[PDB]
Amino acid sequence: AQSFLNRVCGVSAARLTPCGTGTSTDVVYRAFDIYNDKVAGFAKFLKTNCCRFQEKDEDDNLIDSYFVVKRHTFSNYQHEETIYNLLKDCPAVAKHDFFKFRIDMVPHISRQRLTKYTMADLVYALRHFDEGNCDTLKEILVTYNCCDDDYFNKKDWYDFVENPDILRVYANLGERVRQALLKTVQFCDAMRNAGIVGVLTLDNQDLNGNWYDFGDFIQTTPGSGVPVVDSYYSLLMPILTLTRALTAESHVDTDLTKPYIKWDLLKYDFTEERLKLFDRYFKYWDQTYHPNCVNCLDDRCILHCANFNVLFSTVFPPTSFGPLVRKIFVDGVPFVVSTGYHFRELGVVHNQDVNLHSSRLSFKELLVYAADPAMHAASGNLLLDKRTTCFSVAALTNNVAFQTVKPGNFNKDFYDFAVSKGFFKEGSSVELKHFFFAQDGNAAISDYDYYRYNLPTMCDIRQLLFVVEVVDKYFDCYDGGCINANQVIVNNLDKSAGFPFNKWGKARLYYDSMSYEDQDALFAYTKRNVIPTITQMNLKYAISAKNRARTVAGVSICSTMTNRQFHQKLLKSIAATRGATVVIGTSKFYGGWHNMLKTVYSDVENPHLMGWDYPKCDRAMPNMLRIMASLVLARKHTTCCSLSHRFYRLANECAQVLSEMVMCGGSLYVKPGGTSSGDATTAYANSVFNICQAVTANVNALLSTDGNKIADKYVRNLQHRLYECLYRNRDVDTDFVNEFYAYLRKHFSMMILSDDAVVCFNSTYASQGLVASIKNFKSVLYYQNNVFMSEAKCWTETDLTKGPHEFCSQHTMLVKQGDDYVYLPYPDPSRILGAGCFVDDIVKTDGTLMIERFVSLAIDAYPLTKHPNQEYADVFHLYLQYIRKLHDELRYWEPEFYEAMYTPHT
Amino acid sequence: DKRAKVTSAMQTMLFTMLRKLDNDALNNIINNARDGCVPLNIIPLTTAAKLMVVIPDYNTYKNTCDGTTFTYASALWEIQQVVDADSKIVQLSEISMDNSPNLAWPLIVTALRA
Amino acid sequence: TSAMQTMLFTMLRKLDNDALNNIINNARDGCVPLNIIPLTTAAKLMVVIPDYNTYKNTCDGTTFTYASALWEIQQVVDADSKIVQLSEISMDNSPNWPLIVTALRA
Amino acid sequence: KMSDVKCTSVVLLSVLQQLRVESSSKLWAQCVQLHNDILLAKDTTEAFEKMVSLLSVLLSMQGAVDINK
RNA sequence: CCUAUAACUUAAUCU
RNA sequence: AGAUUAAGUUAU
Ligand SMILES: *P(=O)(O)OC[C@@H](CO)CCn1cnc2c(=O)nc(N)[nH]c21
Ligand SMILES: [Mg+2]
Ligand SMILES: [Mg+2]
Ligand SMILES: [Mg+2]
Ligand SMILES: [Mg+2]
Ligand SMILES: [Zn+2]
Ligand SMILES: [Zn+2]
């Protein structure tokens, strides 16, 4: 009782109060990174072998310091004392006190002045985030002075979009995380010099940074100890950019009170600084780190090193990144061209083919000089734009352009006809909710300012490498590789050629002006050189239900030409495949919607339906996931491209559609990240990203579940093998990648179209935690995608008689068609009526073009006739009567033609 | 055929950007470099004689371009003229907290390098 | 160009709203408003009165009716900033005419 | 009903846009704001007040004679 | 100024 | 039945 409490004090003479009663242990619910032969994973368990004592302050107030008394056995007691005597001189080791006390003489291990939570509690709270179940995260935030306790009274406090002050609140933890990193390096040095072998886990280090568990440590010859730090650093890696742990490295002498380091403006390399950062904070990470990813061995090595570069590039100044320019002489007349590029992710890349003296310019080298933004920015004015927080390179013209968006044109004859037919009554189910919203002249830069949601995000690299192997299995059936210039298929040649090529013609002029040999020479040039390109932002005039402006990205003709020649074989092979997971290219007509849904419900045993939402998907997508998506597509080029060619194609795609220079209103800006909407590979890379986040949610579901309570022994062995393949094994285990893929295809059946997804999943496994659910997606999007996904944007359908709730903004009904029941897609009737009532040209409200327009809208509006709601069905009959009224005011008007569009015989 | 027109237009545009180019403060930074190779983001930051500041409200104006001369990018910039969103010439006497609701925000000030 | 202007007033005259009709009638007689009608709790409105007979029908005292709302008059200037009291208005001193009324609503 | 004033707002803003009212960005910004908030209004009393405030922009400048109508 | 990809409809030529 | 051009509609 009191005597035991006195013994715990010891030489410290600290005022203790017990958290438990008497001499019995105190049971806590903590998060452990455990790997046994019994269980594995990063889950929450019960810790029952410790007595906890809180230390009072001078005024008798409770402080963060705790005394943890652990009783296990005699052999662990003697072994831990033997390890501690070797490790006691290290300041990163918490002070241990070994004694025995008579409760019957059980031995005790007393750890002194620990915090309440370990580092694994912080990592688990940020990596498994739940609103309303974040008490551990709240206690950590109010304990270490990140925010007051009334900060959580503000609603949407956790939301990155609704409240960007949570980034500052989380950045208040970064200094403690950096101190824990330095103390881990000190502990590893002390283990190596003393000859001790053991794994480092996150639950054995407290939030002060001190290490305290040695039960699994074994002794060896001194000078040759090996610490294992893969699980530690890999599970900790998202927190390093969430809390911004390396912020103090920007300052002089790494001192937060000191000012910033004033780097040289002409400095771009930062290679030795990257190596110094890697040796300072990740010294015992075993895999080789290349600061410049041009020296990497394969694409997995590119992923592994580009992950360290997003962390280390937050230290360096933002004027060093982007194109590296060099003066060259053309016929003695000097130019300023780009001879390289400095990436945040890939390091410095230098161009291989560059001449200092050229005596004539061909069409191809004129094209790469016109496309290059170096000439455009070296001639323009300096720009300081304070409307946005994005980086501003230069203003090309002396004015600032202020583009507005016009309102829609009203189609009064159809509205008068619809009012005469009984539509738009008071209290009716169908009302107009889709309009053309006008925008004022500040709309373009306000839409560009939504790239502040894109943050530098470090990934769990071991988890990402396993996930990219599983993601690769989905794209296996497709064929790909390079093609020649004559095999390239262009859909529309009279479209914009981007900037600065839209001053001289459309895409047809450049396709007709270059021969096939010039196009192939340009494509070969991008395999050894990096061409930086400028992307034009254009406001898009189209109907919507929200008043937010929408911008499209216009990519240059050089980038889209070489990207077509690199990617089109794989993209056509994806679009021309039925029955697969990615359903891009599959029509909803002629029974195709029914075939897509039948395919999604393949072998799920206890089937439920699930769909989710990506908040700010084009904006907030991390650069590591976009690079990962690009690498997966480029895995078809194994026999036509070398590794240097594939790296330079990756560097060209990163310099063109990931972090390119963006021209928004006559002025150049730096794109932080995200996806350009005008690249050829956008929908397909979005499909790879969607499959990646789903596989990550399933992995985090299977590893965070308690292994002792998994009833099926196959799933328990699968969770054990999952932890082994993530954190213990370094090489790819293709047999377990096949086994986990088959498990996913059996219990988590997907249907992917470019960030839109429907999942048929086993419900019993999801309630047991063996497959992912909405909560796992919310956690993964929080720690990985830097957004908060509310459960109101998600849906769940427990009755598969009714279809998915929404997919590509179409609902689903079960319809008796002929002798059987099929699934029919129907749209929202507000959208159909708004398309008929509001048009974007004054030439679409007469009897000339409006017949074929209304036919197309009646084709899309036909399946509303099977709806039980009467006004929903009357929408199609209204469009039919109006097609008649247009047909006699100068085979479609008959209803049978529309039915033929949804019956399975094509 | 039409190849000649677009190649002459590309050649003509690319050459008059060198008539616009500063060519003497550009050389002082292009030859102070270790490998004759400098980042692009510092080229208009240290060489461009004209600066344009787009200012959304009055607080940004008093924090950024208060006075006739202001300091940005470790340089000295003297305002030449200010225009509004409708591209009408604003005088500095009009930019005050009293007359701030009557102006067409943003204002685009233009400052030469002193 | 003008067909859009004819289709506006054929459907403005079908909403049958007193406030819209009140300002369209006032505009028809030349009693147009210089600035935008505010709909907040209290803000400023400038109304131009062409001549006397359309002034008595709107103003009787310190309150005039506009857009089915009441606006209390603060200042009357006439083709200058020639401030004119409120006791001036009668037919007895009609030659004593583009006139501005700057008021505030409740 | 509500749909009539939501369509009349569209007709009125295209009328204002034909009269080059976007020559002044201050007037065009609040015209765009009033039009966008009529099109998102739920109560019809809220939509009518904005309609008055937006129609007075047309009745302000002398470019469309209402005498003819 | 007006992007990318996919599907569908209509019209007109050659087969 | 297939290809080409032009136009349109929907989806992302
Ligand atoms: P969806 O509209 O919900 O898609 C999200 C989206 C990001 O804007 C990415 C899909 N995407 C990419 N490029 C696109 C484009 O040019 N047009 C549209 N409608 N969607 C695009
Ligand atoms: Mg432990
Ligand atoms: Mg242990
Ligand atoms: Mg989205
Ligand atoms: Mg959808
Ligand atoms: Zn590498
Ligand atoms: Zn290839």
Side-chain angles (χ1 to χ4, degrees), chain A residues 1-79 81-818 820-906, chain B residues 3-114, chain C residues 1-12 14-27 29-106, chain D residues 1-48 50-69:
Chain A
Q2 166 50 194
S3 169
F4 180 55
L5 199 185
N6 285 311
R7 187 56 193 92
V8 181
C9 295
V11 197
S12 43
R15 293 180 172 94
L16 300 178
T17 181
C19 309
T21 67
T23 61
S24 65
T25 42
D26 195 48
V27 177
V28 291
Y29 200 60
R30 300 285 178 262
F32 307 98
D33 174 33
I34 185 70
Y35 175 65
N36 283 324
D37 288 332
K38 185 165 191 23
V39 286
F42 183 42
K44 269 180 165 329
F45 302 87
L46 266 74
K47 183 93 159 300
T48 61
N49 61 333
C50 292
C51 299
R52 304 187 70 93
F53 288 85
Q54 197 157 16
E55 176 189 0
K56 307 179 199 177
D57 213 17
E58 298 293 306
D59 307 34
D60 265 357
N61 264 293
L62 294 173
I63 67 182
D64 193 32
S65 301
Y66 288 76
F67 275 60
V68 181
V69 173
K70 159 180 149 194
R71 49 180 94 172
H72 188 269
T73 38
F74 196 51
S75 179
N76 169 60
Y77 172 81
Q78 300 176 300
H79 179 68
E81 189 204 353
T82 310
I83 298 292
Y84 177 64
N85 291 348
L86 297 161
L87 286 173
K88 77 193 303 172
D89 57 351
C90 182
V93 184
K95 172 186 173 69
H96 286 66
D97 202 356
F98 296 88
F99 63 98
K100 300 191 186 62
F101 200 83
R102 184 190 291 268
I103 80 167
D104 47 349
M105 286 265 297
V106 53
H108 296 274
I109 308 179
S110 161
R111 274 80 54 100
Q112 300 199 354
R113 284 169 177 94
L114 301 194
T115 69
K116 187 187 190 190
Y117 296 115
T118 82
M119 287 278 292
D121 290 299
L122 171 71
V123 167
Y124 193 89
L126 283 181
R127 272 184 75 151
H128 297 76
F129 175 72
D130 196 4
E131 49 154 1
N133 188 202
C134 46
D135 283 344
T136 298
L137 183 53
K138 290 185 183 180
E139 201 159 344
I140 289 179
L141 284 178
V142 306
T143 291
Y144 305 106
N145 297 330
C146 313
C147 70
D148 46 4
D149 221 324
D150 48 294
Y151 192 86
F152 315 123
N153 296 147
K154 157 155 73 159
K155 297 291 105 177
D156 289 338
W157 64 267
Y158 35 75
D159 212 320
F160 293 94
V161 170
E162 303 313 298
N163 182 33
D165 195 54
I166 201 60
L167 292 175
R168 175 198 59 83
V169 164
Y170 286 149
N172 281 340
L173 281 169
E175 195 55 45
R176 308 192 58 86
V177 180
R178 197 186 76 86
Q179 291 305 317
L181 285 188
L182 296 172
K183 274 176 164 180
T184 302
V185 174
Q186 268 179 333
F187 189 55
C188 282
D189 275 343
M191 283 173 54
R192 186 187 70 186
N193 292 334
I196 288 178
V197 179
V199 299
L200 295 197
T201 54
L202 270 162
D203 51 334
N204 290 337
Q205 183 192 36
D206 61 342
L207 283 165
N208 263 339
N210 300 310
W211 286 93
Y212 54 88
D213 193 22
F214 322 112
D216 279 334
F217 280 12
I218 55 164
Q219 203 178 150
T220 189
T221 55
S224 69
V226 171
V228 184
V229 285
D230 287 328
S231 199
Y232 179 84
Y233 286 133
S234 182
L235 281 162
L236 187 60
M237 264 179 200
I239 321 293
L240 299 189
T241 50
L242 193 48
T243 56
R244 290 191 263 159
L246 297 193
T247 285
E249 285 282 340
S250 298
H251 298 251
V252 184
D253 296 5
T254 323
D255 192 3
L256 274 184
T257 68
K258 278 189 184 185
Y260 293 90
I261 294 171
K262 299 313 165 318
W263 291 101
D264 195 6
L265 269 195
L266 275 61
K267 183 181 200 322
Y268 62 92
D269 211 336
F270 293 113
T271 303
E272 321 287 327
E273 280 84 3
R274 281 169 193 280
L275 292 161
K276 268 180 292 174
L277 281 158
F278 187 77
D279 186 78
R280 179 171 305 189
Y281 296 107
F282 306 97
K283 191 183 166 194
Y284 286 81
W285 184 267
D286 287 331
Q287 192 162 338
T288 314
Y289 162 62
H290 311 87
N292 307 336
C293 278
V294 74
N295 312 306
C296 279
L297 310 172
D298 52 341
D299 56 329
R300 289 169 59 86
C301 206
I302 290 174
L303 274 191
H304 160 268
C305 299
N307 208 53
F308 286 115
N309 278 345
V310 312
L311 176 67
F312 297 149
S313 294
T314 57
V315 179
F316 301 136
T319 50
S320 59
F321 303 105
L324 317 171
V325 307
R326 170 199 320 269
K327 180 169 188 172
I328 65 178
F329 290 124
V330 171
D331 282 17
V333 161
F335 276 31
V336 186
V337 305
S338 281
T339 57
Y341 204 102
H342 181 211
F343 295 91
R344 295 189 146 84
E345 294 85 26
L346 313 180
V348 185
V349 179
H350 276 98
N351 284 346
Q352 307 190 222
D353 304 306
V354 53
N355 54 58
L356 302 193
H357 296 259
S358 69
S359 62
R360 185 58 180 169
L361 287 199
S362 318
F363 195 85
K364 190 255 297 175
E365 54 207 340
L366 265 165
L367 193 83
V368 309
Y369 294 160
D372 173 23
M375 272 307 291
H376 296 247
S379 83
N381 319 309
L382 182 56
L383 166 78
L384 173 61
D385 203 329
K386 323 281 300 178
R387 303 175 287 183
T388 175
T389 58
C390 283
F391 198 89
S392 297
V393 180
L396 304 168
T397 175
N398 304 0
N399 304 146
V400 170
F402 291 104
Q403 192 189 159
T404 76
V405 178
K406 300 198 272 276
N409 289 288
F410 182 49
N411 180 17
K412 194 192 166 37
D413 292 328
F414 175 63
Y415 179 80
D416 292 345
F417 183 71
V419 163
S420 80
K421 285 285 157 300
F423 276 103
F424 312 127
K425 295 282 180 60
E426 271 279 355
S428 169
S429 295
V430 189
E431 42 209 27
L432 297 184
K433 298 174 183 175
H434 291 75
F435 305 95
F436 292 87
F437 288 92
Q439 300 298 330
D440 48 320
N442 283 300
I445 213 71
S446 313
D447 207 358
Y448 185 70
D449 203 34
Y450 285 144
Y451 281 123
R452 70 193 186 255
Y453 297 139
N454 187 266
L455 308 171
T457 316
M458 210 192 186
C459 305
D460 191 327
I461 190 52
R462 287 316 169 203
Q463 186 200 60
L464 180 69
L465 287 164
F466 180 76
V467 159
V468 75
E469 296 310 307
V470 182
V471 165
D472 178 47
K473 281 300 176 185
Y474 287 86
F475 299 75
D476 264 350
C477 60
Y478 309 122
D479 191 6
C482 291
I483 55 183
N484 292 129
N486 51 1
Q487 311 179 220
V488 169
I489 291 298
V490 188
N491 280 348
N492 221 321
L493 286 162
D494 280 294
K495 293 297 199 203
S496 187
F499 185 79
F501 299 110
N502 49 11
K503 309 170 179 172
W504 313 304
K506 328 280 275 172
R508 193 186 295 276
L509 161 79
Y510 298 97
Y511 270 92
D512 295 359
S513 165
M514 308 189 80
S515 62
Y516 286 132
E517 268 89 331
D518 284 332
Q519 293 174 31
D520 282 337
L522 172 75
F523 182 56
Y525 177 81
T526 69
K527 288 188 180 174
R528 290 164 47 86
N529 300 267
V530 162
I531 326 166
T533 52
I534 312 184
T535 291
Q536 200 158 54
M537 280 297 167
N538 314 298
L539 277 171
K540 78 175 300 187
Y541 185 37
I543 200 174
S544 180
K546 302 185 191 177
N547 48 347
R548 206 143 72 97
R550 302 206 305 286
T551 58
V552 299
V555 189
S556 175
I557 189 58
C558 183
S559 161
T560 191
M561 168 182 293
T562 59
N563 270 125
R564 272 179 184 119
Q565 197 158 344
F566 191 74
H567 275 293
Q568 205 182 58
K569 185 169 174 181
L570 166 65
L571 299 197
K572 291 306 175 182
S573 173
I574 289 178
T577 298
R578 316 288 172 250
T581 288
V582 171
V583 292
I584 297 177
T586 303
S587 177
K588 64 172 191 197
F589 296 107
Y590 303 123
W593 193 264
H594 181 80
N595 290 330
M596 272 159 63
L597 294 196
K598 278 314 169 61
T599 289
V600 77
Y601 314 150
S602 53
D603 295 315
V604 167
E605 303 279 54
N606 304 272
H608 275 63
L609 280 178
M610 172 170 65
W612 58 88
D613 166 64
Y614 289 90
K616 312 272 173 309
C617 178
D618 55 339
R619 298 318 169 117
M621 181 155 157
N623 291 351
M624 272 300 290
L625 294 189
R626 185 58 170 89
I627 283 171
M628 178 278 300
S630 186
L631 286 181
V632 164
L633 292 185
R635 259 167 188 226
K636 307 290 174 173
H637 292 75
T638 49
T639 80
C640 47
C641 283
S642 57
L643 286 167
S644 176
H645 284 164
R646 279 159 81 195
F647 176 74
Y648 268 94
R649 287 299 312 166
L650 175 79
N652 265 300
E653 281 157 52
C654 281
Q656 280 154 14
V657 302
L658 182 56
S659 65
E660 77 263 32
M661 292 207 168
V662 158
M663 184 190 172
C664 183
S667 301
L668 290 172
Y669 299 85
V670 166
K671 200 188 157 203
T675 73
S676 300
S677 58
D679 199 12
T681 62
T682 287
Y684 303 94
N686 282 177
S687 298
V688 183
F689 165 77
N690 205 355
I691 292 168
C692 166
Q693 300 279 64
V695 168
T696 308
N698 278 281
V699 168
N700 285 338
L702 199 49
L703 279 184
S704 83
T705 185
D706 203 301
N708 304 284
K709 292 188 284 291
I710 292 173
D712 199 316
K713 283 300 292 164
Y714 174 73
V715 192
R716 198 183 321 198
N717 185 257
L718 194 84
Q719 174 197 51
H720 206 267
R721 285 297 285 108
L722 185 60
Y723 192 95
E724 291 172 23
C725 275
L726 259 71
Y727 296 115
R728 289 298 210 250
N729 175 38
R730 189 158 291 178
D731 284 1
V732 196
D733 189 2
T734 62
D735 301 314
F736 185 67
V737 172
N738 289 335
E739 192 180 343
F740 189 71
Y741 174 77
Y743 173 85
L744 278 189
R745 300 285 314 275
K746 174 60 189 165
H747 306 279
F748 204 85
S749 197
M750 290 193 276
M751 181 168 72
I752 302 291
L753 201 151
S754 174
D755 81 19
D756 221 329
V758 162
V759 164
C760 193
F761 66 98
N762 198 331
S763 181
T764 299
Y765 276 25
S767 60
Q768 288 169 195
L770 314 178
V771 298
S773 67
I774 290 296
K775 149 204 171 179
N776 297 114
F777 269 98
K778 177 196 294 160
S779 315
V780 165
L781 259 55
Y782 200 89
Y783 83 87
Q784 195 159 328
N785 217 349
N786 286 150
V787 292
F788 181 75
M789 182 197 72
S790 71
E791 291 195 90
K793 313 286 168 61
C794 294
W795 55 264
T796 310
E797 190 53 62
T798 75
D799 199 52
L800 263 74
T801 299
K802 308 187 285 291
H805 180 251
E806 179 173 321
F807 184 70
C808 307
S809 74
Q810 318 277 315
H811 307 251
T812 306
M813 41 167 60
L814 199 52
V815 165
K816 183 178 186 57
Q817 204 185 233
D820 45 334
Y821 288 86
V822 302
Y823 291 109
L824 281 192
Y826 69 95
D828 195 66
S830 297
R831 173 73 180 82
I832 290 316
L833 276 182
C837 277
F838 303 111
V839 297
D840 62 301
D841 195 316
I842 221 255
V843 180
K844 311 207 186 126
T845 169
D846 50 350
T848 58
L849 188 144
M850 186 173 167
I851 285 184
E852 69 185 327
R853 178 199 171 86
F854 270 90
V855 157
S856 297
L857 291 171
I859 284 172
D860 266 324
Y862 166 71
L864 290 157
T865 42
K866 318 290 202 312
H867 209 260
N869 212 356
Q870 197 47 62
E871 303 102 347
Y872 275 51
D874 287 322
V875 174
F876 173 73
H877 301 295
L878 169 82
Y879 268 74
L880 217 64
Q881 283 159 109
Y882 195 73
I883 280 166
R884 174 77 178 106
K885 174 194 151 54
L886 297 196
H887 195 74
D888 59 354
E889 269 179 5
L890 54 95
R891 62 184 305 242
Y892 327 120
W893 106 51
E894 287 297 328
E896 298 64 46
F897 159 93
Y898 295 106
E899 278 185 2
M901 291 292 299
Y902 292 89
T903 50
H905 208 266
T906 302
Chain B
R3 175 182 191 272
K5 271 78 71 179
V6 57
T7 194
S8 179
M10 284 186 316
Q11 201 166 23
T12 167
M13 185 212 67
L14 197 48
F15 269 51
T16 66
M17 292 202 290
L18 312 167
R19 315 277 71 74
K20 192 184 288 185
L21 189 42
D22 185 82
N23 277 4
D24 67 312
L26 183 69
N27 269 108
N28 296 314
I29 62 167
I30 214 80
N31 305 136
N32 277 118
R34 169 200 65 179
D35 294 343
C37 183
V38 294
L40 177 55
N41 294 2
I42 72 153
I43 293 283
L45 200 67
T46 78
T47 300
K50 190 185 169 100
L51 160 69
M52 289 167 51
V53 188
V54 182
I55 296 156
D57 56 352
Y58 181 67
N59 303 110
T60 312
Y61 183 80
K62 69 176 179 63
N63 292 11
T64 315
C65 314
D66 212 357
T68 311
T69 66
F70 63 101
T71 287
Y72 173 66
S74 178
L76 192 54
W77 303 94
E78 51 178 335
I79 299 180
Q80 193 185 216
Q81 154 199 25
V82 172
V83 303
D84 49 0
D86 305 320
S87 303
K88 266 80 173 176
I89 298 170
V90 190
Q91 318 303 317
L92 298 189
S93 299
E94 312 182 43
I95 315 169
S96 66
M97 183 71 253
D98 180 30
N99 209 38
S100 177
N102 298 155
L103 294 172
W105 293 95
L107 309 175
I108 301 107
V109 316
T110 293
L112 283 182
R113 198 182 280 259
Chain C
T1 301
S2 57
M4 195 76 107
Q5 284 174 142
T6 61
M7 82 174 291
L8 178 55
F9 286 137
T10 55
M11 75 175 62
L12 260 182
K14 195 178 186 99
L15 314 176
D16 196 80
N17 184 72
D18 44 22
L20 305 176
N21 288 326
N22 190 12
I23 71 166
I24 286 162
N25 290 353
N26 294 310
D29 291 7
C31 166
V32 288
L34 278 178
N35 63 334
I36 297 95
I37 323 291
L39 68 152
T40 182
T41 304
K44 192 177 182 70
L45 168 63
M46 301 183 172
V47 178
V48 163
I49 309 285
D51 58 299
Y52 170 64
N53 200 358
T54 187
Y55 192 70
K56 60 185 288 184
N57 296 22
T58 316
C59 278
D60 49 355
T62 83
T63 298
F64 77 97
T65 74
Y66 193 87
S68 71
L70 299 189
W71 311 73
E72 56 181 0
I73 308 111
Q74 304 312 301
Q75 170 164 259
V76 177
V77 304
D78 47 331
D80 305 77
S81 295
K82 181 185 175 185
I83 199 164
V84 177
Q85 69 270 12
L86 279 77
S87 168
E88 183 77 31
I89 51 166
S90 160
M91 192 274 290
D92 196 3
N93 49 2
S94 175
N96 312 70
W97 260 126
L99 184 146
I100 319 174
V101 172
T102 68
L104 299 153
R105 75 183 295 183
Chain D
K1 43 163 206 74
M2 187 57 144
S3 287
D4 283 284
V5 73
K6 279 176 170 185
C7 291
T8 319
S9 156
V10 172
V11 176
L12 175 60
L13 202 80
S14 61
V15 156
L16 282 165
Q17 195 264 310
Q18 273 155 198
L19 300 161
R20 287 206 169 196
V21 81
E22 66 186 4
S23 289
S24 63
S25 65
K26 253 201 303 178
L27 194 45
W28 179 240
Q30 56 186 345
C31 284
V32 159
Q33 177 76 35
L34 286 162
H35 162 87
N36 285 175
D37 287 330
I38 292 153
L39 293 183
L40 270 183
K42 288 177 296 186
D43 193 20
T44 178
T45 311
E46 191 69 28
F48 277 122
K50 286 151 190 161
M51 193 68 214
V52 175
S53 189
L54 193 63
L55 181 53
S56 51
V57 193
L58 172 66
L59 302 179
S60 266
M61 60 192 53
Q62 279 65 23
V65 297
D66 36 5
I67 318 273
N68 183 316
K69 289 83 172 187

